[PDB]
Design a protein around this ligand. Structure first.
Ligand SMILES: OC1(c2ccc(Br)cc2)CCNCC1
Lengths: 450, 167
């Protein structure tokens, strides 16, 4: 027997007007899947007495800010904990309702501070209230969980075998002044860029993605790690194009395209799909795509490598998607797909479902977004067994192919360079002098030492 | 085999461009959308009594991958250049989008349509006549659409298919 809704809101029974479910059950746990409900019913199920629901807690705490503010959530979980009484009945209620519920709200508080501490870093009064609440919790059964929460808060307030030998080509260790596309070793370009891109991939948090906040006016405040990651990717595509169209001599430009395809081959080996696609985007750009005299002189083996990479992107990433699903970490996924799927999930589904005239929060929409962020995180756990080279790393971090130019200015310059080096038919192909005073022959993509 | 039209949606981010394609594909009376499945971007339609398949590419959310536009744009035969009627910057960006499409396709006459989307109850800053004037200057159709009511969505897409057929 539970108290009245007039005294305790979470006692109100379930109905089609306050909670609705999906036909299926949690695959591994046999728990019903909540489709929609009121904030009171979602909070009740977040801290349910019958069973624990880690998947729902994980989903809720990731995606709740679209329908409930952090202050309002804390107020709701404090209310839930403060259970009033409605002998045999009283002793059973304390053990089958009050004790399990109070423990579940403490697990929520613990999951919140551990995995979503940003809410507290961003609102110091929210933490003041959490600490005040956690102070008022009493009981021998609670002390274990209350100490753990305090231990996390204070920790949050404070803040393998041998890898392969680093590969060198024309540029030697320490001689950063000569580092360039053709002087650094194609294997080391790909490894050092895979390390940068892997770290950029791993720094992106769900707080930057949930709510499509990277597309909104405050995207620079709310999605900074995602945008640094996209901007590096964009910079490498532009650098690859620049290298190509600024090599005016055909023989040297054939050598440039060929080396970039070797860097692609190594990105494929390393499962760096962001890198693979940086190269495919450069090759399919307007200035590079049209360079028929350059691509004709490219070895067939390399044409086929580039062609298979291009095909990953075809038919809405069909082959990319299957290839990613089949490989295991470490890998660097292409983020763009995730971004489009989160946006369209949020924009293509309603925030609310209406049942018998009452508004219900659409939780399934949120679950679908938490499914995408979970898949992003599964690839963020494993690092590459590759040694960092601090000078090569720095060279790629500081590439600035655009310079002080704006996007239009620069991409028009690249396109006008393309038309100059390979004019539009029936204009004859001019000749241009060499710019490289070192050998153009590649060392290959096979390691030089065992 | 029925004809398949590869369409590409292009436009500014942050102004609800994804609604145009989501509303086309979605059956009205079903508001449940899953961008993960093939059926979410492929639709069988009958335009002027001739059945065809529309394959629509909308990279909504990947605007910062500015060096991937050429790649994505090259997949298309027809383009929907979309702006929000409540955002003048998105309208002003159309000129460059079109210029890239022309460059990518290596053609001054690429099947294209100008779409003005009413994405929310924010105030209109782009008058119908401004967009109708711009569309005329390029020699292309202008369609206004409502993201809330589905008004104009089918006309935008069907007008593009007719532009491709009459190319
Ligand atoms: O063979 C071309 C090519 C193929 C694949 C990619 Br990716 C980029 C370009 C270059 C030469 N013009 C035709 C396409």
């Amino acid at each position: 027997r539970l108290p009245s809704a007039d005294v305790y809101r979470f006692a109100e029974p379930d109905s089609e007007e306050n909670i609705i479910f999906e036909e299926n059950m949690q695959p591994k746990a046999g728990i019903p899947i909540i489709k929609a409900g009121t904030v009171i019913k979602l909070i009740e199920r977040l801290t349910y007495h019958m069973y624990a629901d880690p998947n729902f807690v994980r989903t809720f705490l990731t995606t709740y800010r679209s329908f409930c503010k952090p202050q309002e959530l804390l107020s709701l979980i404090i209310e839930r904990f403060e259970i009033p009484e409605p002998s045999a009945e009283l002793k059973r209620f304390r053990k089958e309702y009050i004790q399990p519920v109070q423990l579940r709200v403490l697990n929520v508080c613990r999951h919140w501070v551990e995995h979503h501490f940003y809410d507290f870093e961003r609102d110091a009064y929210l933490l003041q209230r959490m600490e005040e609440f956690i102070g008022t919790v009493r009981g021998k059964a609670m002390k274990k969980w209350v100490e753990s929460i305090t231990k996390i808060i204070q920790r949050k307030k404070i803040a393998q075998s041998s890898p392969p030998t680093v590969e060198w080509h024309i540029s030697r260790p320490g001689h950063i002044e000569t580092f360039d596309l053709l002087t650094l070793h194609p294997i080391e370009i790909a490894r050092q860029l895979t390390l940068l891109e892997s770290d950029l991939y791993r720094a992106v948090q769900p707080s930057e993605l949930v709510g499509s906040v990277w597309t909104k006016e405050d995207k620079e405040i709310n999605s900074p790690n995602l945008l640094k990651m996209i901007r590096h990717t964009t910079n490498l595509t532009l650098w690859f194009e620049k290298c190509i169209v600024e090599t005016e001599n055909l023989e040297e430009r054939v050598a440039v395209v060929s080396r970039i395809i070797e860097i692609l081959q190594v990105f494929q080996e390393l499962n760096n799909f962001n890198g693979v696609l940086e190269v495919v985007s450069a090759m399919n750009s307007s200035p590079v795509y049209r360079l028929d005299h350059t691509f004709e002189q490219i070895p067939s083996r390399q044409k086929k490598i580039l062609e298979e990479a291009h095909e990953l992107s075809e038919d809405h990433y069909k082959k990319y998607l299957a290839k990613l699903r089949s490989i295991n970490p470490p890998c660097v996924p292409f983020f763009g797909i995730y971004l489009t799927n989160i946006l369209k999930t949020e924009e293509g589904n309603p925030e609310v479902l209406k049942r018998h005239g009452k508004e219900l929060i659409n939780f399934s929409k949120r679950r679908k977004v938490a499914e995408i962020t979970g898949e992003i995180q599964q690839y963020q756990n494993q690092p590459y067994c590759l040694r960092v080279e601090s000078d090569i790393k720095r060279f790629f971090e500081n590439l600035n192919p655009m310079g002080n130019s704006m996007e239009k200015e620069f991409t028009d310059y690249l396109f006008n360079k393309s038309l100059e080096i390979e004019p539009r038919n029936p204009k004859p192909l001019p000749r241009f002098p060499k710019k490289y005073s070192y050998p153009l022959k590649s060392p290959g993509v096979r390691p030089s030492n065992p | 085999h029925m004809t398949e039209y590869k369409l590409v949606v292009v436009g500014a981010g942050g102004v609800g461009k994804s609604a145009l394609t989501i509303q086309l594909i979605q059956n009205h009376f079903v508001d449940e959308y899953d961008p993960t499945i093939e059926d979410s971007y492929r639709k069988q339609v009958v335009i002027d009594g001739e059945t065809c398949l529309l394959d629509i590419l909308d990279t909504a959310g990947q605007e910062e991958y500015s060096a991937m536009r050429d790649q994505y744009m090259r997949t298309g035969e027809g383009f929907l250049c979309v702006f929000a009627i409540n955002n003048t910057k998105s309208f002003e960006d159309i000129h460059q989008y079109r210029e890239q499409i022309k460059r990518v396709k290596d053609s001054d006459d690429v099947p294209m349509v100008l779409v003005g989307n009413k994405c929310d109850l924010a105030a209109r800053t782009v008058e119908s006549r401004q967009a109708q004037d711009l569309a005329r200057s390029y020699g292309i159709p202008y369609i206004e659409t409502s993201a809330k009511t589905r008004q104009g969505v089918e006309d935008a897409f069907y007008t593009l298919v007719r532009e491709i057929r009459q190319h």
